[PDB]
Amino acid sequence: MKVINVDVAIIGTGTAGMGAYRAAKKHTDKVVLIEGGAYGTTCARVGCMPSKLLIAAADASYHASQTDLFGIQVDRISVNGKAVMKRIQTERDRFVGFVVESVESFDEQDKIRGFAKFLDEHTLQVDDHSQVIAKRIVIATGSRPNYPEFLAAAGSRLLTNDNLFELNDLPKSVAVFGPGVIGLELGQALSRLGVIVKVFGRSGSVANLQDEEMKRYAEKTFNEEFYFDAKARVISTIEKEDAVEVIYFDKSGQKTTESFQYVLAATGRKANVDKLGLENTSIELDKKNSPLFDELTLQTSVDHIFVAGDANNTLTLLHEAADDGKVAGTNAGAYPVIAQGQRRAPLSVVFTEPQVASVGLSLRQIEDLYADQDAANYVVGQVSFEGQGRSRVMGKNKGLLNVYADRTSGEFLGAEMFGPAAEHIGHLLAWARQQQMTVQAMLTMPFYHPVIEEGLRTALRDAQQKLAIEKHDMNEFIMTH
Amino acid sequence: MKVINVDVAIIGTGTAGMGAYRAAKKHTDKVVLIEGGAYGTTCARVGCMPSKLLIAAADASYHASQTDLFGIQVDRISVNGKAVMKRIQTERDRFVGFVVESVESFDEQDKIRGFAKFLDEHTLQVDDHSQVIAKRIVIATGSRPNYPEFLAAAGSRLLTNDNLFELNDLPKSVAVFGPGVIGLELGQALSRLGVIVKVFGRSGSVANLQDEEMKRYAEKTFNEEFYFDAKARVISTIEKEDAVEVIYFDKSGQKTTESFQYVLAATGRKANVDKLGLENTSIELDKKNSPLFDELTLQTSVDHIFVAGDANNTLTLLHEAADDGKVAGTNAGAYPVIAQGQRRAPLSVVFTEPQVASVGLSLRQIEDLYADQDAANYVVGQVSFEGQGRSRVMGKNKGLLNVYADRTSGEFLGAEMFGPAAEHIGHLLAWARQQQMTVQAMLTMPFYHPVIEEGLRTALRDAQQKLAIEKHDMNEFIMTH
Ligand SMILES: Cc1cc2nc3c(=O)[nH]c(=O)nc-3n(C[C@H](O)[C@H](O)[C@H](O)COP(=O)(O)OP(=O)(O)OC[C@H]3O[C@@H](n4cnc5c(N)ncnc54)[C@H](O)[C@@H]3O)c2cc1C
Ligand SMILES: Cc1cc2nc3c(=O)[nH]c(=O)nc-3n(C[C@H](O)[C@H](O)[C@H](O)COP(=O)(O)OP(=O)(O)OC[C@H]3O[C@@H](n4cnc5c(N)ncnc54)[C@H](O)[C@@H]3O)c2cc1C
Ligand code: NA
Ligand code: NA
Q1: Closest listed ligand to the CA of B38
Q2: DSSP letters for A300-342
Q3: Domain at A261, CATH number
Q4: Which of A51, A428, B146, B356 is 20 to 30 A away from residue A111, measured at CA?
């Protein structure tokens, strides 16, 4: 067995891992990247890229059926499932190819093929062929799909993101479990593509939305289009000869048996930290067996072992994994010099229609920091997109936007939005939060006409008029003497 | 003839005028609004709203024909012209009604019906019935269509924004004339709705773009969809029995005769300041008889007479007219106490597909700013939307974006974009400009994945690499120690 010494070993050649490698190489030449599976990152392979590709097809198909409002009729929209799948697959391959070329450009001696596990706090074994002794180690192993036990009975008809995009044809029908980002994006897209869909979640959850009014509005809006029970009681999902039989109670509590060609487990993903031999370290774990970590430095309780990307089960977003990589890589490279990452303002997006964006502090974080049981030093500004001019012009007038502000200073804290162009409004808001703008300042910014951003102006005015600050600092337009 | 004294008289009850009234009424009770035409504002009646309404219908129709990229096919797309025109009309009547309700709420004695002209610098006459003795006067009379003499031979078949939206049905064919941006917005929309259209522009102009490369790429792009000659040489447009005969030279310079059902003037608006009896005042005029005015205070050479909105032939955009009304109303209301408006960062949008946005300083204004245009003290960061991932996923991968930055400081100066979602990126960029951001700082902002704003990241990196700041003293991600 070959033994190698490195300053930095990075387990996982995904987004976080490749970011960690580039960062760590600026501090030290002695960095290895280990990869047990296919190169290309989860994002380009079976993540962001194919899912967005699926969505683009779905929205082209769906919007073609919604032109009558405008005075146009479209006859026989027909979904060629083989074509839909082929396009997704070929574009997906193209994206993966770019990552593979980057991986290929790295020094051959810096890449080791195989699955790593810890033997002790400085020794990794990769398969049965190599041992790496590393001064510092970065766990960048991502997440995998995961599902409750009952879903396992769907057998060979159980889909995840790992196999959904490899189908040669679109399915006839899919039962989707998991009411979060992936589950709603994929269920809606499939439903828009002529697939018979129902989406079941259990806890009342809708995407990552925290506000109760928002969750209910979104759930009801989705149900105008396809079946979505955020509080479903599901008995079983059992593979038959040609289908999966799903036994569940509907919204009227009526027991229902219904066959679906497939089930999709868009349930909670699992961080890849359970199969890496952590029990051979003193890494402290929470009551769910997730590694505890410093959220600024990415250090576990073992100060020379870091955890980055989906592996730390936090900020499980692509751009965040990339930032995690920079933090873990720099800190692994420069150790024992340790710095804290200055995180970008939180930005989270769901590519449904209408879209969801969450920006800045979440509602729970705001309640924690700006309120208690009996008093609040924050206010909420709101707008409905139903009566918003441009949204109505486009026939997209559905949605709600909540904006949160410090009640004393007017500092913009965060937001939730379910509505059109939420992805873009999310950026606008996220840049405003990172700059620590106040709502009064943001009201002085440009708002064109007629645009969706004007809905944001409405929500900001709503918040502003609730602030403890003087009436006469409520100028939306500044004049100087 | 009945005579009234006011502190402030406002000529024109559109966007600028209604704004001026509200601002003026904060300072004094004696203010009147004079209106010669229909209430509603130009924006709501025959401007932004119905044009955006036509565009949305156009977009749905066209996108319905573009589904095969994604693997979806249609049998047929059928454009019911009458329903298309009706929805535009009913929706705009809705928007107009809101404006009308506001006007109706204003004190009866604050509103005079008729066209005003100056008898002298403190006296207005409204038609033949009223004279207003006014301490301060705001000219907020908007702009009107203007076109060369040859176009007038199109007689009852000449269209402008004033009558286009009033057609009971979509025309079979329309020739559009002039360099006006409205020509591209409306021409493309008409074309996308099945109307046979040719756009004959002038002098190389393309949607107000200033960069030579951008203009050419945009003209080429548009030409993949509809006939557009930015340098057209046109002989005549003469009304016949059921159409207009257009005689012109095609793109190879050959004299061509073609019938179009209507003709649409897009030849640049005229400010309504030629029929106000301005000869009865000492107001200083430029060589094209536009009143000179202070761009910050909106005062003419006569210090108690202001000019606001499209009337001053500057920043002829809706939200800028609103700010104009605010500046002019405040200054007219509080005269002799005068203040300088602090303008928002420039933002203009052309709602074609792909969209156009210009942000901050124009290219001309940048070239002016630098004493030594040789020594090149600004940089250009560039991106093509052709290889931009999300844009490709959506089948929207056409366009370019230039960002401008000071070479020493990296101060973000302004931008031009032709690309998907330019309206939204335009806002993000305009907020960044108003907050005086550097390109270095903008790169520390959140950029989600996979999104169109990742193209902005590419362009910002391109500018940044070119800066004279210390090469490895601008990190994209900040860490503290
Ligand atoms: C369907 C779907 C859609 C998504 N859409 C979006 C979106 O639109 N926007 C967004 O921001 N995020 C999206 N995400 C989330 C995003 O994909 C993740 O945040 C991101 O890919 C995580 O990056 P990573 O580097 O941590 O993980 P990965 O890219 O998975 O890297 C982990 C790597 O480590 C390897 N590995 C695991 N164990 C070992 C071992 N022990 N030894 C060696 N190698 C190992 C794996 O093979 C893998 O290559 C989506 C995710 C999914 C599943
Ligand atoms: C087709 C079209 C599309 C457009 N789209 C957009 C867009 O998408 N976004 C954008 O920002 N801008 C757009 N614009 C520009 C926008 O409409 C103008 O910037 C805006 O309307 C100017 O408003 P205003 O108050 O200055 O003029 P107006 O709203 O026209 O008000 C002037 C008023 O004065 C009255 N008047 C004139 N003379 C007299 C007189 N002597 N006595 C009494 N009353 C008088 C008129 O009747 C009118 O009511 C568009 C314009 C057009 C034509
Ligand atoms: Na993470
Ligand atoms: Na103006």
Answers
A1: 2
A2: -SSTTEEE-GGGGTSS-SHHHHHHHHHHHHHHHHHTTS--EE-
A3: 3.50.50.60
A4: A51
